[PDB]
Amino acid sequence: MESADLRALAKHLYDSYIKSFPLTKAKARAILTGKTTDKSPFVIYDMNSLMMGEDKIKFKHITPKEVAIRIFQGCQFRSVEAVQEITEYAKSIPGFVNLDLNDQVTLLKYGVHEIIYTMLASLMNKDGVLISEGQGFMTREFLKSLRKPFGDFMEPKFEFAVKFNALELDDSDLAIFIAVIILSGDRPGLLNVKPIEDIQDNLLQALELQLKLNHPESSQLFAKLLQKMTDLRQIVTEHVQLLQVIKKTESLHPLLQEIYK
Amino acid sequence: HMESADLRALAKHLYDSYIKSFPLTKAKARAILTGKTTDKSPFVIYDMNSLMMGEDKIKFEVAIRIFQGCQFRSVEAVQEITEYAKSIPGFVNLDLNDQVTLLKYGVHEIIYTMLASLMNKDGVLISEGQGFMTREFLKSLRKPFGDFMEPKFEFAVKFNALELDDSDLAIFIAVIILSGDRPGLLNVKPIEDIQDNLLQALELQLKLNHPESSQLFAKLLQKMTDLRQIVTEHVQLLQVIKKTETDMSLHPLLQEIYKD
Numbered sequence: 001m002e003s004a005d006l007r008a009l010a011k012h013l014y015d016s017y018i019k020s021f022p023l024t025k026a027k028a029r030a031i032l033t034g035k036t037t038d039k040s041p042f043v044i045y046d047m048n049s050l051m052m053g054e055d056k057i058k059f060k061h062i063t064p065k066e067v068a069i070r071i072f073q074g075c076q077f078r079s080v081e082a083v084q085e086i087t088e089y090a091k092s093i094p095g096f097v098n099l100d101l102n103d104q105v106t107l108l109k110y111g112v113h114e115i116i117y118t119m120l121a122s123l124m125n126k127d128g129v130l131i132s133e134g135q136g137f138m139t140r141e142f143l144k145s146l147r148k149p150f151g152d153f154m155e156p157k158f159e160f161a162v163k164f165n166a167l168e169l170d171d172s173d174l175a176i177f178i179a180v181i182i183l184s185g186d187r188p189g190l191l192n193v194k195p196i197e198d199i200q201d202n203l204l205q206a207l208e209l210q211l212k213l214n215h216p217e218s219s220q221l222f223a224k225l226l227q228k229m230t231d232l233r234q235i236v237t238e239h240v241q242l243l244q245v246i247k248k249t250e251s252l253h254p255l256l257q258e259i260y261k
Numbered sequence: 262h263m264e265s266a267d268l269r270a271l272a273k274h275l276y277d278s279y280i281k282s283f284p285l286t287k288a289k290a291r292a293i294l295t296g297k298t299t300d301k302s303p304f305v306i307y308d309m310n311s312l313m314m315g316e317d318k319i320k321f322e323v324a325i326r327i328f329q330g331c332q333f334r335s336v337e338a339v340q341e342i343t344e345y346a347k348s349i350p351g352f353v354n355l356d357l358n359d360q361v362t363l364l365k366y367g368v369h370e371i372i373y374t375m376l377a378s379l380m381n382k383d384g385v386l387i388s389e390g391q392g393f394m395t396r397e398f399l400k401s402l403r404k405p406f407g408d409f410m411e412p413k414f415e416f417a418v419k420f421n422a423l424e425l426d427d428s429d430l431a432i433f434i435a436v437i438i439l440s441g442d443r444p445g446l447l448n449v450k451p452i453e454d455i456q457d458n459l460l461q462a463l464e465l466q467l468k469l470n471h472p473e474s475s476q477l478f479a480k481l482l483q484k485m486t487d488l489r490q491i492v493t494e495h496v497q498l499l500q501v502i503k504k505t506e507t508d509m510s511l512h513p514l515l516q517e518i519y520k521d
């Protein structure tokens with residue numbers, strides 16, 4: 001591909017990424033660092049501040065239980081929203097809607113988890129995570145200190161995010177990276193791998209040029225970012241095993257179960 | 262960042278060490294596998310009696326005996342990879358604990374990678390290439406052993422579709438060893454500095470040697486994902502086997518690597 005076509009693809013994905021997702025990394029960083037002019041987020045650091053944050057912020061999430069469960073269900077509620085946002089974004093990826101419909105379903109099914117982890121890092125620092133489009137901030141130490149298996153379920157997300165954020169990618173970088181994850185030709189059950197790798201080869205070309213122009217000083221950043229797809233594959237399988245352990249230990253309305261299946 | 266003439270110098274140096282360290286290259290393995298030759302023809306083991314005939318012909322209970330044949334070559338491979346790693350510029354200058362840590366977690370991923378060179382879809386070379394044992398025979402071993410053999414073939418068929426030669430693999434293997442993300446490393450930065458140079462060398466090598474193969478660099482790094490997951494499955498499968506087979510000891514080299 002000619003470089004001007006790669007740049008056009010990079011911008012097409014950036015513009016769609018801005019429309020699809022509620023809180024960009026650029027805004028998230030201004031909040032976390034405290035450089036923004038907007039109001040300080042509500043901070044949840046323990047039981048009583050969580051209670052006020054629900055009565056203050058309008059948590060649609062569960063808020064119909066026990067605190068560790070309620071938080072867990074808040075992460076699931078937001079993840080369900082993120083899947084729809086990613087599904088919408090994927091449609092803007094040139095070539096995606098022309099794929100066999102079953103393959104589109106399969107690529108989203110196996111990709112959304114890796115993309116959620118990746119984009120969750122945009123909302124985290126070493127001390128906590130933004131919530132509710134940035135109106136709130138809940139501390140890492142509070143999440144890490146939840147009882148039984150919940151504390152150990154939260155912390156791996158921060159340990160990854162802290163590592164991923166040291167690459168210092170911005171939104172224009174992430175927009176292409178996310179597209180590369182979706183167009184993975186090795187997902188189980190794909191019917192027609194060739195046009196998926198064909199598209200990914202083009203996204204990879206655009207990612208490489210984007211990182212060289214946007215980060216001329218960061219050597220082999222392309223490779224370092226692809227190496228992070230190893231971090232992603234491993235933590236997602238670990239994650240699946242942690243949910244399976246939770247289910248066998250911790251009922252919900254059958255309709256709710258369907259929603260979260 | 263490096264000048265390209267220095268990157269090519271590193272590519273030749275690593276290919277040269279790889280030829281010196283590893284007994285059976287992919288180029289030789291492919292010549293044996295494709296045949297057309299009379300001198301290099303292997304004896305083929307496809308069942309019990311041909312295996313029994315195999316001792317008197319080549320140098321090679323059956324589920325265990327074959328397993329011990331795989332572990333013997335694995336231990337030799339750890340020795341070969343250790344020798345190779347010492348040739349990687351900068352490696353012997355790292356903190357001694359980090360040298361051990363990089364080998365500890367790197368050898369398995371490299372064994373799988375290089376085992377693919379000895380395989381096609383129908384079986385694997387053995388006894389320095391004098392033999393060939395069929396995939397379906399290995400898959401048909403009893404107990405848990407059959408299902409322990411087959412995943413190695415499932416990876417190899419996919420990896421081999423990249424059509425790397427030895428000069429590519431020499432650099433790829435070096436990149437794997439110098440991973441700064443291994444658990445417990447003391448000084449990550451000097452390791453990442455070496456990997457950046459190797460990555461630069463791999464990228465330029467793949468562009469010159471495989472100019473028609475678009476984004477092969479990226480596709481090869483993506484295979485380092487398959488390797489991380491398949492090594493974990495291997496370890497977990499070995500541990501389950503151990504808890505059943507008391508007539509199985511492991512070489513101290515392998516035994517230490519699996520400890521933690």
Ligand SMILES: O=C(O)c1ccc(-c2nn(C(=O)c3c(Cl)cccc3C(F)(F)F)c3ccc(Cl)cc23)c(OCc2cccc(OC(F)(F)F)c2)c1
Binds near residue numbers: 059074082129138154
């Ligand atoms: O915006 C966003 O983009 C977003 C995206 C993701 C999360 C989030 N998901 N999550 C999961 O377990 C998870 C993941 Cl990674 C992938 C797939 C499926 C799942 C799940 F299905 F199993 F969940 C987390 C675990 C811990 C934390 Cl720290 C965050 C996450 C996210 O979390 C916002 C958040 C943080 C803390 C309290 C909270 O709920 C509250 F409002 F406080 F009650 C909400 C945001």
Ligand SMILES: O=C(O)c1ccc(-c2nn(C(=O)c3c(Cl)cccc3C(F)(F)F)c3ccc(Cl)cc23)c(OCc2cccc(OC(F)(F)F)c2)c1
Binds near residue numbers: 335385499
């Ligand atoms: O040369 C070589 O480079 C070489 C390298 C690797 C193997 C080989 N190892 N292996 C393992 O299980 C394994 C691995 Cl990956 C990593 C670490 C530890 C282990 C182990 F500790 F747990 F083993 C395999 C499983 C199945 C097969 Cl197909 C091959 C392997 C290799 O296998 C040669 C071989 C194949 C079949 C019969 C046989 O024995 C016989 F000659 F028939 F007697 C020898 C060669």
